[PDB]
Design an enzyme around this catalytic site. Structure first.
Site, PDB file in Angstrom:
ATOM      1  N   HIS A 115     -33.210  92.121 -12.449  1.00  0.00           N
ATOM      2  CA  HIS A 115     -34.654  92.044 -12.221  1.00  0.00           C
ATOM      3  C   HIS A 115     -35.271  93.442 -12.393  1.00  0.00           C
ATOM      4  O   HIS A 115     -36.366  93.580 -12.937  1.00  0.00           O
ATOM      5  CB  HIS A 115     -34.987  91.529 -10.821  1.00  0.00           C
ATOM      6  CG  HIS A 115     -35.000  90.039 -10.739  1.00  0.00           C
ATOM      7  ND1 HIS A 115     -35.974  89.282 -11.351  1.00  0.00           N
ATOM      8  CD2 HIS A 115     -34.130  89.160 -10.181  1.00  0.00           C
ATOM      9  CE1 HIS A 115     -35.722  87.994 -11.144  1.00  0.00           C
ATOM     10  NE2 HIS A 115     -34.602  87.897 -10.454  1.00  0.00           N
ATOM     11  N   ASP A 143     -38.678  51.244 -17.503  1.00  0.00           N
ATOM     12  CA  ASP A 143     -39.678  50.506 -16.711  1.00  0.00           C
ATOM     13  C   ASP A 143     -39.390  49.016 -16.803  1.00  0.00           C
ATOM     14  O   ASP A 143     -38.941  48.485 -17.851  1.00  0.00           O
ATOM     15  CB  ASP A 143     -41.062  50.714 -17.279  1.00  0.00           C
ATOM     16  CG  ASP A 143     -41.627  52.066 -17.001  1.00  0.00           C
ATOM     17  OD1 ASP A 143     -41.009  52.934 -16.287  1.00  0.00           O
ATOM     18  OD2 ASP A 143     -42.713  52.262 -17.582  1.00  0.00           O
ATOM     19  N   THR A 169     -33.259  80.311  -8.979  1.00  0.00           N
ATOM     20  CA  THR A 169     -32.056  80.435  -8.163  1.00  0.00           C
ATOM     21  C   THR A 169     -31.768  79.248  -7.272  1.00  0.00           C
ATOM     22  O   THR A 169     -30.679  78.668  -7.354  1.00  0.00           O
ATOM     23  CB  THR A 169     -32.152  81.751  -7.366  1.00  0.00           C
ATOM     24  OG1 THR A 169     -32.271  82.842  -8.313  1.00  0.00           O
ATOM     25  CG2 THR A 169     -30.876  81.983  -6.606  1.00  0.00           C
ATOM     26  N   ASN A 223     -43.925  55.541 -14.896  1.00  0.00           N
ATOM     27  CA  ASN A 223     -43.867  56.235 -13.581  1.00  0.00           C
ATOM     28  C   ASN A 223     -43.015  57.489 -13.670  1.00  0.00           C
ATOM     29  O   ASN A 223     -42.631  58.039 -12.633  1.00  0.00           O
ATOM     30  CB  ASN A 223     -43.331  55.316 -12.477  1.00  0.00           C
ATOM     31  CG  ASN A 223     -41.920  54.795 -12.751  1.00  0.00           C
ATOM     32  OD1 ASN A 223     -41.330  55.025 -13.829  1.00  0.00           O
ATOM     33  ND2 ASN A 223     -41.369  54.078 -11.775  1.00  0.00           N
ATOM     34  N   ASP A 227     -28.020  89.516 -10.696  1.00  0.00           N
ATOM     35  CA  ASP A 227     -29.446  89.185 -10.689  1.00  0.00           C
ATOM     36  C   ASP A 227     -30.255  90.335 -10.104  1.00  0.00           C
ATOM     37  O   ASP A 227     -31.307  90.679 -10.628  1.00  0.00           O
ATOM     38  CB  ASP A 227     -29.691  87.917  -9.867  1.00  0.00           C
ATOM     39  CG  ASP A 227     -31.178  87.491  -9.762  1.00  0.00           C
ATOM     40  OD1 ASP A 227     -31.729  86.754 -10.594  1.00  0.00           O
ATOM     41  OD2 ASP A 227     -31.802  87.803  -8.744  1.00  0.00           O
ATOM     42  N   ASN A 243     -38.306  77.988  -6.308  1.00  0.00           N
ATOM     43  CA  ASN A 243     -38.051  78.919  -5.209  1.00  0.00           C
ATOM     44  C   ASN A 243     -39.204  78.892  -4.205  1.00  0.00           C
ATOM     45  O   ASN A 243     -38.988  79.151  -3.020  1.00  0.00           O
ATOM     46  CB  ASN A 243     -37.817  80.336  -5.739  1.00  0.00           C
ATOM     47  CG  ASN A 243     -36.438  80.521  -6.367  1.00  0.00           C
ATOM     48  OD1 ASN A 243     -35.515  79.731  -6.138  1.00  0.00           O
ATOM     49  ND2 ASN A 243     -36.286  81.592  -7.145  1.00  0.00           N
TER      50      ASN A 243
END
Ligand SMILES: *[C@@H]1O[C@H](CO)[C@@H](O[C@@H]2O[C@H](CO)[C@@H](O[C@@H]3O[C@H](CO[C@H]4O[C@H](CO)[C@@H](O)[C@H](O[C@H]5O[C@H](CO)[C@@H](O)[C@H](O)[C@@H]5O[C@H]5O[C@H](CO)[C@@H](O)[C@H](O)[C@@H]5O)[C@@H]4O)[C@@H](O)[C@H](O[C@H]4O[C@H](CO)[C@@H](O)[C@H](O)[C@@H]4O[C@H]4O[C@H](CO)[C@@H](O)[C@H](O)[C@@H]4O)[C@@H]3O)[C@H](O)[C@H]2NC(C)=O)[C@H](O)[C@H]1NC(C)=O
Ligand SMILES: O=C(c1ccc(-c2ccc(Cl)cc2)cc1)N1C[C@@H]2CN(C(=O)c3ccc4[nH]nnc4c3)C[C@H]2C1
Ligand SMILES: [Ca+2]
Ligand code: NA
Ligand code: NA
Ligand SMILES: [Zn+2]
EC number: 3.1.4.39
Length: 806
Positions: free
Chosen positions: A265, A691, A159, A685, A261, A180
């Protein structure tokens, strides 16, 4: 401390934030425990509910009411959203036929169409079709405006990373909200969903849309809503702000819904309980549009209906436990769930080793439902590595599963039936985009695109200059009726040299051999033609890539392929060749198996050498243009030039040889010819960016030959596959990949089997956009096509996902 003695009297949902200890009256104060004593009574009225009924019409204004049905309410800007329908015989917005909005129809004093972003948490893309019967308002926005079949979220599909990516145009690795939950080892501080650290500005990088607007003189409504403010009140607050005088009135607004949402859930993405939340969100949309219609704003405002991510079926029984793999499970901290992130539990532990942890987690159980990666080895399309808040060890979890440290974590922390967070190419994680208004197109469907692209468009909608971000500005011009941003191609920085024959064979001492000493003006004038570019139109179809940084490189032409050869890196930056549907695959003749040939256009000093590969027991070599696809036995010799050689681990050569011997031909057969551009990438990196020479961490032993971290290929053909790749009159079609150049195939649990069982699956996982390759190489592709530049930008952001039908 807040001294909540002041009053919210005439200040309800004030725009400027006031710092402690003066009490606040803004839509955030609840979350801050800072609201004035009378905030609820004055600012959160609920009396009589949210709708006008027949008997309320003409009522005498009662200030205690949540919204009004009195004759003065339109000018006070505070009618119930259904006032005109109930009391003045009007229709609901949803019931009106749609009519193209060719120009903004704004009331006097509006300097620009306002933008309203209606964001819905956990709104899975397939809801648009699967719930369309219970969402008539949303269905009208979608069918009448501009919509995509789905929008791709960023990884992880959580989220806060996605909402802040929406606000900034940035990858989470760049904006800093990489989950989160997070730990920042420089701050020594944790970001949690619960508490006050998450408010601290230091977590939040880049520049969100509301800050961009404000810095450039465009006022913004607040984007954040306290969870207890009911949706009807959020809507009434927006409509009230839209009746502010011109100098005070925001031009950008956001609404946010916790649904679907919240219920997803609990019940799963398609639980029967999910119909009601979809209805309720639709009703909220209906309220907004009705309220806009009353204000005469419904043909003035641009509305964006946008989700952060979808929702997948996940239950407690589908959990993998690290305690079934690791002996030292107490020496680690895991961030758990639909992704895993592992670090040492204690910094004072010198018996912590990431290599033994990864090894204990690699291909240990037949049906293992997660795969470990050092973050630098994750698919480059995730762009998920370049931040200190991202732990070195990462677990990519299969869709429908969780990972947890120990079983006690799952029962002493089934409850849930839905979750999200998985790989952002997963169908269940896709979400929605609809744009409706005078600046969007009418009844137009656009291809799926990535949420990083929206910030630029939201800036375009508001006349703002976007802060630097990861969208590709102009790639979403096809969504817009006007305000398109007309980008210009980047200027080439380095021009190529075009070397002729300048060296004799005996000047070279590369330790290479080739059985090539076998021999005619007919065929000799012809090979001269080929070395000057006589076949270049066949093999370089979209112009040479432009080099966007300062370097020294040569264009090399051949019968079957063209390359841009870097004298700095000793190998091509790119190799371009076309394979027609009719082309034939041949094998490398026995006598040529180890043949490498000096290139008489390139000095010994700027060539590789075979001795380095002999002496490096870990490193072998491959070729960019494949000898298997040579047009003739004589052209084959070109493929063995030292200038076509690249360093490859034996393990990677298994992948690469299968791609070159089997897959290119397969693609040419399927797509009616393909054009291939291949080359090395160096990103030691792991920042997603080319690079420089001084960043290279590994060379072929005893040489200056740099070892690529990755190899890419861009495979282009005609979208109308009735036309061959080399005679295409219209739009193009592309798929690309960026394969990790690794010394083992540990990533592929089936790699002991024949390449036909595992190589293509590897390549699909490492699918990429052309633009990802551009960032990694400093090259700009598709410089010379007959297509509009905006259309080419869209092509370069395309990602071939290999998921089935949404
Ligand atoms: C996606 O789009 C984004 C945005 O365009 C791209 O990110 C940019 O890329 C640039 C190159 O990596 C980078 O430019 C650098 O800026 C440095 C100063 O940066 C600060 O100021 C900006 C502007 O306001 C700010 O945005 C930065 O914010 C970062 O850091 C803060 C705090 O940590 C975070 O809150 C924020 O989230 C963001 O973090 C992200 O970026 C940083 C890098 O800046 C990462 O470290 C994080 O992990 C995270 O990803 C900063 O507050 C500047 O100092 C750099 O210049 C150095 O290098 C050049 C070489 O050319 C040289 O000229 C200078 O001398 C200097 O070298 C010196 O420092 C070296 C390193 O310390 C040292 O080794 C030397 O010896 C020298 O002393 C550099 O110019 C830019 O900051 C980011 N912007 C953002 C928003 O992230 C991103 O690349 C795109 N991705 C892809 C794949 O295309
Ligand atoms: O205030 C905002 C906000 C809204 C819109 C925009 C926004 C940003 C950009 C645009 Cl363009 C528009 C709106 C920016 C912030 N909040 C507060 C909400 C708190 N919250 C969760 O506790 C939560 C919710 C679902 C979850 N599933 N799993 N864990 C979860 C945890 C979600 C947060 C969103
Ligand atoms: Ca790099
Ligand atoms: Na070797
Ligand atoms: Na393997
Ligand atoms: Zn959620």
């Amino acid at each position: 401390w807040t001294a909540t003695s002041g009053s919210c009297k005439g200040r309800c949902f004030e725009l400027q934030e006031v710092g402690p200890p003066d009490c606040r009256c803004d839509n955030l104060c609840k979350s801050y425990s800072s609201c004035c004593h009378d905030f609820d009574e004055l600012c959160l009225k609920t009396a009589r509910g949210w709708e006008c009924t027949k008997d309320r019409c003409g009522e005498v204004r009662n200030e205690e009411n949540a919204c009004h049905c009195s004759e003065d309410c339109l000018s006070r800007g505070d009618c119930c959203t259904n006032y005109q329908v109930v009391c003045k015989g009007e229709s609901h917005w949803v019931d009106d036929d749609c009519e193209e909005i060719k120009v903004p129809e704004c009331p006097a004093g509006f300097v620009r169409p306002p933008l309203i972003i209606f964001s819905v948490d956990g709104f899975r893309a397939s809801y648009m079709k699967k719930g369309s019967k219970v969402m008539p308002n949303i269905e009208k926005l979608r069918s009448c405006g501009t919509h995509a079949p789905y929008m791709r979220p960023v990884y992880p599909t959580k989220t806060f990373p996605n909402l802040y990516t929406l606000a900034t145009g940035l990858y989470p690795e760049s904006h800093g909200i990489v989950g989160n939950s997070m730990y920042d080892p420089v701050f020594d501080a944790s970001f949690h969903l619960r508490g006050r650290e998450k408010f601290n500005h230091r977590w939040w990088g880049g520049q969100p849309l509301w800050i961009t607007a404000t810095k450039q003189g465009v006022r913004a409504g607040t984007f954040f809503w306290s969870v207890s403010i009911p949706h009807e009140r959020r809507i009434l607050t927006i409509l009230q702000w839209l009746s502010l005088p011109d100098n005070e009135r925001p031009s950008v607004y956001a609404f946010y819904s916790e649904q679907p949402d919240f219920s997803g859930h609990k019940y799963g993405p398609f639980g029967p309980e999910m119909t009601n939340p979809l209805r309720e969100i639709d009703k909220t949309v209906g309220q907004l549009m009705d309220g806009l219609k009353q204000l005469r704003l419904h043909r003035c405002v641009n509305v964006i209906f946008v989700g952060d991510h979808g929702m997948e079926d996940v239950t407690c029984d589908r959990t993998e436990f690290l305690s079934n793999y690791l002996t030292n499970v107490d020496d680690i901290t895991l961030v758990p769930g639909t992704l895993g992130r592992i670090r040492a539990k204690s910094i004072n532990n010198s018996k912590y080793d990431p290599k033994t942890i990864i090894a204990a987690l690699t291909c240990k159980k037949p049906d293992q439902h997660f795969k470990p990666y050092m973050k630098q080895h994750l698919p480059k399309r995730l762009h998920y590595a370049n931040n200190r808040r991202i732990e070195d060890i990462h677990l990519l979890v299969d869709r429908r599963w969780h990972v947890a440290r120990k079983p006690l974590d799952v029962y002493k922390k089934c409850f849930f039936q839905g979750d999200h967070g998985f790989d952002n190419k997963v169908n269940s994680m896709q979400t929605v985009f609809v744009g409706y208004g005078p600046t969007f197109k009418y009844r137009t469907k656009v291809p799926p695109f990535e949420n990083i692209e929206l910030y630029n468009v939201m800036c375009d909608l508001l006349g703002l200059k976007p802060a630097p971000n990861n969208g590709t500005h102009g790639s979403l011009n096809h969504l817009l009726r006007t305000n398109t941003f007309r980008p210009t191609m980047p200027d080439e920085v380095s021009r190529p040299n075009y070397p002729g024959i300048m060296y004799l064979q005996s000047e070279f001492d590369l330790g290479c051999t080739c059985d090539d000493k076998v021999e005619n003006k007919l065929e000799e004038l012809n090979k001269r033609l080929h070395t000057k570019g006589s076949t270049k139109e066949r093999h370089l179809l979209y112009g040479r890539p432009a080099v966007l940084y300062r370097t020294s490189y040569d264009i090399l032409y051949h019968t079957d392929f063209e390359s841009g050869y870097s004298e700095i890196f000793l190998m091509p930056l790119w190799t371009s060749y076309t394979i027609s549907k009719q082309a034939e695959v041949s094998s490398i003749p026995e006598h040529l198996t180890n043949c490498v040939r000096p290139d008489v256009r390139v000095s010994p000093g700027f060539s590789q050498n075979c001795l380095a590969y002999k002496n490096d027991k870990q490193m072998s070599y491959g070729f960019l243009f494949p000898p298997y696809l040579s047009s003739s036995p004589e052209a084959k010799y070109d493929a063995f030039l030292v200038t076509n050689m690249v360093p490859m681990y034996p393990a990677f050569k298994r992948v690469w040889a299968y791609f070159q011997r089997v897959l290119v031909k397969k693609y040419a057969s399927e797509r009616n010819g393909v054009n291939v551009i291949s080359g090395p990438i160096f990103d030691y990196n792991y920042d997603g960016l080319r690079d420089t020479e001084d960043e290279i961490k590994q060379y072929v032993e005893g040489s200056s030959i740099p070892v690529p971290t990755h190899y890419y290929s861009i495979i282009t053909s005609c979208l109308d596959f009735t036309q061959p790749a080399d005679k295409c009159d219209g739009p193009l079609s592309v798929s690309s990949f960026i394969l990790p150049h690794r010394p083992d195939n540990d990533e592929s649990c089936n790699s002991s089997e024949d390449e036909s069982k595992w190589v293509e699956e590897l390549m699909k996982m490492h699918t990429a956009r052309v633009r990802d390759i551009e960032h990694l190489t400093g090259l700009d592709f598709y410089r010379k096509t007959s297509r509009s530049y905006s259309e080419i930008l869209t092509l370069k952001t395309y990602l071939h996902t290999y998921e089935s039908e949404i």
